[PDB]
Nucleic acid binder design. Structure first.
Lengths: 75, 136, 65, 94, 81
RNA sequence: UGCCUGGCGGCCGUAGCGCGGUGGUCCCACCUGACCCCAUGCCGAACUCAGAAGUGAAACGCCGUAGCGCCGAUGGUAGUGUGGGGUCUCCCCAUGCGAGAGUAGGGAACUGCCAGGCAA
RNA sequence: GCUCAACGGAUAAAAGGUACUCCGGGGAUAACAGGCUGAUACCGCCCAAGAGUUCAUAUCGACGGCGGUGUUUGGCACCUCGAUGUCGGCUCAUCACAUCCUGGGGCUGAAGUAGGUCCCAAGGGUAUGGCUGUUCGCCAUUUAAAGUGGUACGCGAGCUG
RNA sequence: UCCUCCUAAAGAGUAACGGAGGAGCACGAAGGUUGGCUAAUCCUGGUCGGACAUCAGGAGGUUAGUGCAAUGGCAUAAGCC
RNA sequence: GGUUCUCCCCGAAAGCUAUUUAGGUAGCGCCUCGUGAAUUCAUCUCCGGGGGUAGAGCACUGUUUCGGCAAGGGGGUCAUCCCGACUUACCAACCCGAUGCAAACUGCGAAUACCGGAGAAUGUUAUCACGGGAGACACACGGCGGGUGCUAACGUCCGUCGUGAAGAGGGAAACAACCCAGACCGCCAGCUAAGGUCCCAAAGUCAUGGUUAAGUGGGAAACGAUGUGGGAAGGCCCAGACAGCCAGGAUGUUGGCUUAGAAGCAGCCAUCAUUUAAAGAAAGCGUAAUAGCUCACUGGUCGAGUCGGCCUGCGCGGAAGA
């Protein structure tokens, strides 16, 4: 007697770690903050993680709470 | 009918019954009724097993129940078609995996405890066995 | 004081036949969805209140009860 | 006093252990000090009636391996789910 | 099909040569007929439900014990209908 | 350089909490005063300045301690890709992969840059 | 400036009936009947507290459990919509055995008579009327007994309607 | 029609008259910045005050809070002034 | 509904979106033809990744069991109006320990899968963009993972694969999807696949070792049973065991208690030491209550193994329809 549903938003990691992405590429489209911005990586207003420079993506684990960061090194 | 009062949801999936048991060791008591087959123990049977076991030992001893239903299983009203939504919960079942101990006893001789479990097995749908508490 | 519905499961005979009146071919054929029970006097649940149902002139109840 | 014979294995896996348990012999392991955790393979039937005795889990056992005698101590026993059979025993090399 | 069992001897306040007993209200027989029990105006039943039973003709103590209890269950069956 | 203290990182619970002991030339903390800069939706506690007689309780560092937290094999087990099988509401065989929990055990950190102090 | 919420929004503006029906289509989708399943129904069985003076199993057997058949109601739409005419009665049957009588046996809370219950058995047999459109059912009176079902809940290119 | 969860078989996506709930707004501040602060609930004492009023210490630790449903996320606070 | 000669090449879909749409249609997905393009794409290996599913776990979200502890409301002796002393036998949580469960729980967590890079072989370019023309948008079953359903259905709805659909030929007696296997044509040729080799019906009455008495094979459950084979452990055992046979089975007793008649045997209930190789103040029948036969139990003769269960191989009953 309820039967309802919301249209999925296609979240998750679009471009993975190890990809030489372009300037302005969305690295991860998330809802919370499962991944934080790092070097040359911009965090959007919806916490969408975008790029600034070019190069391969690295998923770094740092911080006290072991939260995952993402950076882009130009190689 | 052993129902868990004040629960979270009201009706859930039927799911599957896979793998072996977890609570396989014979705890606390000296004896235990272990499960051999793979079935679905309802609350009414469980009530019947405890009823048909206290008559044999006659008020003495300690009766432990190493199981609990906690699974609301629904049924559809008879003479209505399919669909229209999932039915209303009728009874509660306990999922049973092979190797799960059901009842444990202590404060009773090896003789009287054994035939007590013989009557309890006749009230349950699953094929069982009888095992002693082993050290280490 | 304390009173609880008994309705002896099995002691009450239950038959099923077709309905009466009008209603297409579903009421003369598979209309066996109609009941017609049988509660003999041999049942006797209260025993002494039972003899009061038998001598009690009423319809829906024969001479043999 | 509670001596029993043993043998070392050649294959350590699910394909191995299931295959050998069907021919009446079960796997075990012993560990102690800084040596190698020896993969023990011993007879099934004898040990079942051996562990029925409660003194089996108190006294220092005296298992053998290729002539050598090693005094071990039973620590953990991994029984069967619903059958009166044995699966894996963890001895501590004492 | 409705097995009857009027089990006496329970929540009672039987005070007493010829009995003058009361009946406790906070229990015995639920709201559907309890409201039917609390809505009787015959001035034997007070405004609380601690009913003042004044059975005095059944002389003997143990006799009036049950006769006043008979006055109780008879008043009960009338008000539980 | 052996140790020292403080700032800033790496590595981020093997690195931390609890308990007991312990350090003061210097450093740090505490401490003195607060009409001036500034300050409390009240208050020199916090914040800021000006100083610093006394001290090491507190805080911090260090040491012992596993009293707790944490790390964690080997083997087994669960599961599982593919291919076969059965009694096929679930398991078995071949083969590749292979946990979590638990056990032995480990464990009260390691390292770099800078600045002066120390007996140099 | 539109709850154009039937929310990609047919016009600015729109509710019903048809058994007087009608055409074009569909077994893509119902009603009868068949098929799969067997929840339900029916039958059988396991357990055994209690009842039965005593006594669980002469006769029952609560609490629960395990199957069978495919006669009920259902589920599902797989066949039929360029048609498979559907209740009852009549006529004529016919098969099954989970047997109502006759026959052959065991037990008994079987003295005798008469009974209760289980097992073997399907050869033969297995009412007439009153009331109702009835199946059923109630009743009157019988009979050794007035079986249960399957057979498109047999039978309308056989009748009745 | 739209939003969150689950079903959704560890990318995305994925139905059912499947299982749970919400939206048809609010705010010039609840927005931006700078600076500061960072809980809930319990033990104890104390003017009326007891179940919790205000205040103080202690434990505790984000079980808090975030204009709203739920999930995800947050103290380097997006929490509070 | 019907839609008329032939041959050659390739070859679908029954999905998603939206629709007064749901048996229509539109675009995209999949087919085809032509065009032009980058080792462009696919399988394997290595490498670099994030996932949280299965499993698992129980700190968290809830739920559940037992034990140790434990205030507070009440109950009570009481205040015998509060205050209050005490106990708590009660409802008795909170915390500690021990045990389970979860689609909407996660301090854990694979395998696969998915995205990206490098590397080799291979494939008539299998990848993509562009244009011409489509069809199709009713799908079915089987396998695996589910929802739903009664862990019913050739049921229904998805995911994914396969097959049919649009694919014959062999096999499962018959049998679109099950197993093997992809028909260019011809041959009175040979080798295999699933499956088979007494006859029907082409091929072993084949070779060796065991198993079953039911025609099991060749329909099935709980459950019952000295069926019978294998294997292991245990008990007593020619100071002679098991079972028959030769005998006893006793002393107080009405056993005290209700001693109302209920004498080991209607019932509470408790139950000793004697004669000794042994004998329960009692197993059953029968009894108002007796007795008797006695059974446990204990000695002799015969005189050798035997008793009771455990795990399994295969069977028997359970098992009745037109």
């Amino acid at each position: 007697r309820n039967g309802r549903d919301s249209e999925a938003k296609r979240l998750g990691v679009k471009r993975f770690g190890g990809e030489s992405v372009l300037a302005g590429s969305i690295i991860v489209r998330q809802r919370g903050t499962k991944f934080h911005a790092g070097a040359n990586v911009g965090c959007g207003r919806d916490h969408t993680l975008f790029a600034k420079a070019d190069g391969k993506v690295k998923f770094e684990v740092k911080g006290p709470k072991n939260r995952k960061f993402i950076s882009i090194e130009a190689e | 009918m052993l129902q868990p009062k004040r629960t979270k949801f009201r009706k859930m999936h039927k799911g599957r019954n896979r793998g072996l048991a977890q609570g396989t060791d014979v705890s606390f008591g000296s004896f235990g009724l272990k499960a051999v087959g793979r079935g679905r123990l309802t609350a009414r049977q469980i009530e019947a097993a405890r009823r048909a076991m206290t008559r044999a030992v006659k008020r003495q001893g300690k009766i432990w129940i190493r199981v609990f239903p906690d699974k609301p299983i629904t049924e559809k009203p008879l003479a209505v078609r399919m669909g229209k939504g999932k039915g209303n919960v009728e009874y509660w079942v306990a999922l049973i995996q092979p190797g799960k101990v059901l009842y444990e006893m202590d404060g009773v001789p090896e003789e009287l405890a054994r035939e007590a479990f013989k009557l309890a097995a006749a009230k349950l749908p699953i094929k069982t066995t009888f095992v002693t508490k082993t050290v280490m | 004081i304390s009173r609880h519905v008994a309705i002896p499961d099995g002691e009450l005979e239950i038959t099923a036949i077709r309905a009466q009146g009008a209603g297409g071919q579903h009421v003369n054929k598979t209309s066996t969805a109609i009941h017609l029970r049988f509660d003999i006097r041999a049942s006797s649940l209260p025993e002494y209140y039972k003899e009061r149902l038998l001598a009690a002139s009423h319809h829906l109840i024969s001479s043999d009860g | 006093m509670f001596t029993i014979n043993a043998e070392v294995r050649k294959e350590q896996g699910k394909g191995a252990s299931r295959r050998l348990r069907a021919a009446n012999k079960f796997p075990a392991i012993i560990y102690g000090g800084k040596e190698a955790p020896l993969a023990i393979e011993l007879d099934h039937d004898k040990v079942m009636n051996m562990q029925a005795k409660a003194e089996f889990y108190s006294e220092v056992l005296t298992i053998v391996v290729d002539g050598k005698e090693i005094k071990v101590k039973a620590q953990d026993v991994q029984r069967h789910p619903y059958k009166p059979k044995l699966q894996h025993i963890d001895f501590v090399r004492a | 099909i409705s097995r009857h069992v009027a089990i006496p001897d329970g929540e009672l306040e039987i005070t007493a040569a010829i009995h003058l007993r009361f009946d406790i209200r906070a229990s015995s027989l639920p709201e559907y007929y309890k409201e039917r029990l609390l809505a009787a105006s015959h001035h034997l039943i007070s405004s609380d439900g601690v009913i003042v039973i004044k059975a005095q003709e059944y002389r003997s103590q143990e006799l009036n014990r049950e006769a006043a209890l008979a006055r109780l269950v008879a008043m009960i069956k009338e008000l539980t209908t």
